[model samples]
Target: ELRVGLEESELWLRFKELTNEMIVTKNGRRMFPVLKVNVSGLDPNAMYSFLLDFVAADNHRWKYVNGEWVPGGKPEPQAPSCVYIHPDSPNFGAHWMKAPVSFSKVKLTNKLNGGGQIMLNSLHKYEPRIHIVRVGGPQRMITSHCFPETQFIAVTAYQNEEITALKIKYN
Candidate 1:
């Protein structure tokens, strides 16, 4: 299983603050935040599983269409699903988290690219959760609370403003 080595890293703190800020509406908004985790204390020779899941803030899911966030779109009526995983999860755990663990590469899509499935929503708030599991080691698993500092933006078009702010000062 993945062991969390640092509780309050600079990345975590910065993300938390961004999530607290009120999301404003404009041409587009970006998630000012992203998660960068540092992991350690794992067997370097064994495989591990990392999963990312997103849950709606309320019972209602949201959808983005025509550059607007709306509601009442028919979402796939399936059980909640995992959205992304660390690409190197099939390898040794020690090698996966040996450096700055970056989950920012993850994306949200509904097309089902044969990887993790996309979460369907119309216009609701959502939170992402990360899970770390050990392979062939008594089935150990650990789940971390959602990082609130990450910023999510509703955008009308493509722009670099949505890129994650990797570092921030904490009080």
Candidate 2:
């Protein structure tokens, strides 16, 4: 049994106003508005492996042409993907359901050298995907969910525009 859903939608919406820019680095960097979940209706007998992945939401590369995101040439090649596996994997349903499922540590890296990091293309739109896999049972099943509000544009060069003003105002 499963009642899969996003945990902090209200928090996510606040970031969306700024276009949800995630800082991506070649050495790996933690993401903002950290991905969180609220899973429920567990079978109690089953344990699950909760994880997240970064996937391209769109194929087009974008350029700010007169404040409008215009489709540019082919985007940078996407690096190999990795999942942020829960440290408490294989725990009983009671453990997973007893609390608000959380993963405050999400890394955005464009390199494959660093381990346990979500790989993405800077200057490209990407989506955050949550995965739940049932373990400790003969039948293993995986449930995946994607959040539209979690979509963001990855960047390396400092944002010298919109986010810059917001960063100064908020920071």
Candidate 3:
């Protein structure tokens, strides 16, 4: 069976325990503890492509309260979906397995024309998803994965000092 494992699983777990927060900017901002993964059990000669996208985890907006995230109310208008394609896509499976696939280039934005970055609404929790497609293969041949530990709330600024300190400590 094919396997797609989350890299830096421990770091993601740490963030998950504390309610991970992803900063969104008008221009765009890089994600910390950058999303990465490794795959196996593929035809070495087969071609493939990778994509990154995010889904709102829930409809409720979030607010930082008592050093934790609490439901604020209904969310603002959700942003249109944007998908980021890996620059090295449509490569042979051998190349994909040669090294860890990193999505460090993916950025988060909260504006129109994000310059290819993913758009997110502030105070909304989101779950990142990965889609792998086999090029020139069977129709609709795609595999998708979502790591709950990688989910986070979008924010314009850091709300918890502890979360900020952890981010600094890791750097």
Candidate 4:
């Protein structure tokens, strides 16, 4: 069976334990402690592709109130979503399985300027997912994985001081 595992799983959990927050700017901000993964059990000679995307963790919009997050109200109009493909995609499966897959190049933006960055709403919770595609097979197949520990809230500015300290120390 094809399997995927999170790299820096412990580090991600550390942030998740404190309720992680990612900054979104008009120019787009690269994720800290970026999503990285390792995969196995693919046909070495076949071609494959990989991608990452975000989804709302819940329907409620969130607010950081008094050092804690609470549902502020219903979500705003959904932002246009995009799937970020690995720059080295459509390579042989052997190439993919040879090294850890990192989505370090993905950026988060809150603007509608129509750039390549993924759009997100400020103060919203999001869950990220990874997708693997087998394009060389008789039938194209797609597989997706989600790590609960990788979830976070998008903020225009860091709302929590503790989160900021951790980000500073690590990245």
- From the highest lDDT down, the ranking of the candidates is 4, 3, 2, 1
> What lDDT score belongs to each candidate, Candidate 1 first?
0.50, 0.74, 0.86, 0.88
* TM-scores for the candidates: 0.56, 0.83, 0.93, 0.94
Scored against the true structure, residue 63 in model 4 reaches a CA lDDT of 86
TM-score of 2: 0.83
Model 4, 37: alpha-carbon shift in Å? Answer: 0.6
Best-fitting candidate, scored by lDDT: 4
lDDT of 2 by residue, 1-171 (tens): 578777778767766765767788877787666677778888776778887787877677766566555567775556535778877886877788877777767678767765877677777877888788888788898888888887878878545366555544544
Q: How accurate is candidate 1 locally (lDDT)?
A: 0.50
Top model number, TM-score = 4
- Summarize candidate 4's per-residue lDDT along 18-126 as a digit string, tens digits: 9999999998999988998989998889889998889888767888889998986655655536889889987898998998998888889989767678888887788
Candidate 2 residue-wise lDDT at 130: 79
Q: Provide the lowest-lDDT 10-residue window in model 2.
A: 162-171
For model 3, how does the per-residue alpha-carbon lDDT over 1-171 read when each residue is reduced to its tens digit? 879999989988988888899899988999997888889987889999988999888877898987879986655555546889988997999988989889988889988662687788888889989898989876647899987889999999999877798789896
Clashes of each: 11, 0, 0, 0
Candidate 1: tens digits of C-alpha lDDT, residues 1-171: 445643345654554443322132322122334456667776777677777666554554445555444546555443564557777666677676667666655655433455543443323455656677667677665656564444243223332222222322322
